[PDB]
Amino acid sequence: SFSQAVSGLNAAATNLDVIGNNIANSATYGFKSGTASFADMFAGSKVGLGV
Amino acid sequence: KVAGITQDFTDGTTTNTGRGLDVAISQNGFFRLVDSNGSVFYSRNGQFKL
Asked: What is the dihedral of CA B8, A6, A34, B48, to 10 degrees?
């Protein structure tokens, strides 16, 4: 369906906002890098639901 | 007719991230986690915190 695709389409934007923040802060003196971590979703059925 | 939606349990590639508490099994095996209620689960994603 559309929801399974839009979940991945939405998850692939936080994983660019985080990289853009890291690129911008790569000049400072005490910055710590940030990363994101994803997990899948599963309801009572066997077909998945996305990210 | 659909007889079933079922998995494929092969192994993908391996990406060295260079952190400390990150394990990756190379073959058959599962890490055994225990829930708050006392249930037991078996997983393969191996990124841990402390």
From this structure: -30
CA B26 to chain A, closest CA, distance in angstroms equals 21
B29 Rama class: left (phi>0) / alpha (psi -120 to 50) / beta: left
The span from the CA of A9 to the CA of A51, in Å, is 9
Distance linking the first and last C-alpha atoms of chain A: 14
**Do B4 and A46 lie within an 8 Å CB cutoff?**
yes
Which chain B residues are closer than 8 Å to A46 by Cβ? 4-6
Q: CA B24 → CA A51, B3, B32, distances in Å?
A: 22, 33, 14
Q: Which technique? A: cryo-EM
CA pair distance B7, B37, nearest whole angstrom: 28
